[PDB]
């Protein structure tokens with residue numbers, strides 16, 4: 001009962017499983033094509049705020065929580081010691097971790113831990129199967145029973161719906177298993193490399209638009225073991241404050257000086273560049289050997305794009321270098337799917353190094369780096385992962401190659417464009433409907449991530465638990481991951497969902513939010529400068545036609 | 556096109572239709588959700604501290 | 616040793632925290648602190664007035680004399696602010712490797728900048744509170760002296776240009792560098 005059960009697969013006809021994994025389009029009117037911005041710069045984004053009493057209530061709640069937590073910790077660890085044997089010295093040995101460094105997890109998150117780490121089963125498609133569990137004590141241990149129920153999926157990184165067990169990719173993977181075994185001999189330098197690795201590398205290099213590319217087995221290791229190859233203690237790195245942990249770990253391992261600039265502030269970046277060029281190295285005022293700029297394509301937390309032409313202008317005029325990450329932008333953004341370069345029309349030669357990850361949009365595991373020729377030839381000899389780690393297995397390579405060929409159009413014609421149109425329409429429709437209902441939604445008009453703000457801490461577990469009873473799966477984030485005031489729920493849209501599912505979700509979310517008083521719109525979301533408190537039927541009837549027009553989005 | 560998915564009927568929509576207290580329920584929700592109670596355990600006695608209503612009830 | 620990463624606990628009547636080296640300062644403080652960043656945000660300056668008003672109303676609901684009520688509310692506010700800011704040293708979550716284990720929340724505000732508007736406001740509020748509160752217990756000299764001593768000793772001296780990175784070994788051997 002305590003251990004997680006192993007679920008026997010169910011027997012169903014092919015059509016039912018296909019419908020469960022991938023939906024079937026009802027009308028050809030649910031598709032949208034994405035245009036390219038030639039010479040229109042990105043306007044400064046606008047954010048909306050709630051009234052003051054929300055902030056005051058949040059601060060009071062946090063103050064009470066902190067006071068009570070500290071009082072309980074002190075009294076419990078002073079008046080008794082038998083229960084707290086994992087936080088005290090025993091036979092002259094220090095404990096594993098410290099009291100003060102794990103206060104939040106032990107005292108705040110533990111009471112709502114049931115909303116995290118939810119076991120599942122089966123393919124994560126349109127409907128995801130979940131194992132039922134019963135909470136005991138206060139989220140201490142769980143008891144499992146042999147019962148599974150389906151739920152709607154809004155919490156998985158599946159943008160183009162490639163997570164399927166029936167299709168060309170699965171057949172390619174099975175054929176690869178038949179030909180190449182799952183064994184990997186060793187590092188790519190010794191025995192690991194084969195012809196399929198070269199095929200994948202050339203195909204990726206042709207798809208992206210650069211000259212050469214390399215493949216890896218893990219996205220984290222692509223960043224964590226890259227910067228030490230060509231950086232040292234006499235170089236400067238300028239990075240946005242909202243960057244992934246892998247980049248920070250790589251820069252820390254490299255040893256270069258780090259300076260950060262505020263998100264979406266180019267003037268501060270220019271001032272910092274000028275000051276760092278003039279001043280030089282600390283304690284010596286010698287010039288820097290080189291300067292590198294790091295940025296991300298699409299930020300998952302807010303769904304906002306980076307300003308690429310301005311960065312290109314600065315890097316050209318001040319003679320700097322550029323590095324761009326496209327983990328959430330490849331295969332899902334642009335007229336064809338090349339990335340932010342197609343969105344902005346910027347030639348890919350300007351960017352020095354490009355990076356990406358197969359898992360978010362292709363249904364595999366890996367990463368890549370794309371650059372010029374001589375850079376790749378030097379980095380191949382200078383890298384550490386190539387000659388010290390394992391190699392990429394064959395089924396993953398087959399899945400990635402099949403997905404890339406399908407999206408490019410070589411095989412299975414008329415599928416990639418249809419998927420891209422589906423995801424664009426779904427994202428736009430959901431964002432517009434949510435803004436018309438009266439909520440607060442962040443991001444650009446066409447972004448697969450839709451963050452909805454839920455300010456008061458006590459309103460997060462209630463929303464998460466109420467949505468589960470209505471068979472909708474959601475993911476919620478909070479402090480310290482997000483700022484103290486702003487707590488949000490993240491929506492991940494797919495190309496497998498259908499307008500009926502969106503309507504069902506909209507009705508249930510609207511009623512739950514009306515119950516929990518989550519509607520706080522100050523009129524800056526509307527393009528006509530007025531408050532929007534509509535009805536659900538009117539939204540469902542009018543939004544699908546009017547969502548294609550671009551005049552209804554502030555940004 | 557059929558899928559093995561169960562649809563939960565919505566409250567106030569084919570649940571209470573085919574099948575004074577609303578004000579009390581709304582007041583209770585407003586009192587509970589806007590205060591810090593869910594991340595508390597065993598701290599339901601903190602509501603006793605909110606006896607100020609009784610103190611201000613008496614006038615003159 | 617090949618790294619030489621140790622914490623010193625030199626004992627003296629007056630001592631200061633040594634300046635951080637290159638690796639600890641220029642590299643291990645790059646990401647947002649998430650502990651002193653919320654100070655310059657929305658609704659972070661009006662909350663103190665709300666706390667003062669709530670304390671005053673709570674004490675007045677008991678039905679005591681104005682002198683005792685105001686002395687108690689001043690002492691409680693100042694003691695609470697001191698406990699929150701000046702007493703504790705460190706951060707509740709691991710930052711990089713324990714880089715902020717020698718500094719309080721007051722020192723970490725605005726990246727160790729001495730004079731910022733928020734610091735000015737935080738220094739101004741106790742003086743104005745004392746000026747407003749003294750008018751009820753001017754007759755009693757003992758309470759006036761006690762309030763003056765509390766304000767000057769707790770709410771004024773720590774928030775100064777001097778006593779920055781200042782440690783005293785009288786109540787315990789403090790750790791510097």
Ligand SMILES: C[C@@H]1CC[C@@]2(OC1)O[C@H]1C[C@H]3[C@@H]4CC=C5C[C@@H](OCCC(CO[C@H]6O[C@H](CO)[C@@H](O[C@H]7O[C@H](CO)[C@@H](O)[C@H](O)[C@H]7O)[C@H](O)[C@H]6O)CO[C@H]6O[C@H](CO)[C@@H](O[C@H]7O[C@H](CO)[C@@H](O)[C@H](O)[C@H]7O)[C@H](O)[C@H]6O)CC[C@]5(C)[C@H]4CC[C@]3(C)[C@H]1[C@@H]2C
Pocket residue numbers: 070071073074077078081088098099100698702703704705716790
């Ligand atoms: C009106 C009414 C009146 C009455 C009343 O209410 C109001 O008035 C009130 C007056 C209140 C106290 C006022 C203020 C504090 C301090 C606060 O502080 C932060 C939390 C704790 C940690 O603070 C440290 O955090 C960092 C990490 O520790 C320190 O970092 C360095 O030290 C690191 C060391 O590794 C090195 O890495 C580096 O050198 C460097 O990083 C940093 O210096 C320091 O800030 C507080 O201290 C801990 O001390 C021990 C751990 O050190 C804990 O364990 C100990 O517990 C038992 C006793 O000893 C024994 O059985 C155990 O064996 C023995 O281990 C102990 O439980 C716990 O208290 C915790 C709450 C408390 C106590 C209040 C309690 C409630 C009252 C008594 C109320 C009261 C009821």
Ligand SMILES: CCCCCCCCCCCCCCCCCCCCCCCCCCC(=O)N[C@@H](CO)[C@H](O)[C@H](O)CCCCCCCCCCCCCC
Pocket residue numbers: 059060062063066067068070071650662663666691692694695696698699703704705706707719720
């Ligand atoms: C019935 C009536 C009694 C009422 C009692 C309350 C008294 C209220 C007046 C005093 C409080 C000052 C008012 C201004 C504060 C406004 C609200 C701000 C809330 C901010 C919360 C988020 C901060 C996150 C950063 C965490 C942080 O700081 N970490 C450490 C450093 O890195 C600090 O060491 C730590 O937090 C403080 C330790 C926790 C409390 C210590 C005392 C233990 C409980 C005993 C309470 C005694 C009463 C006086 C506080």
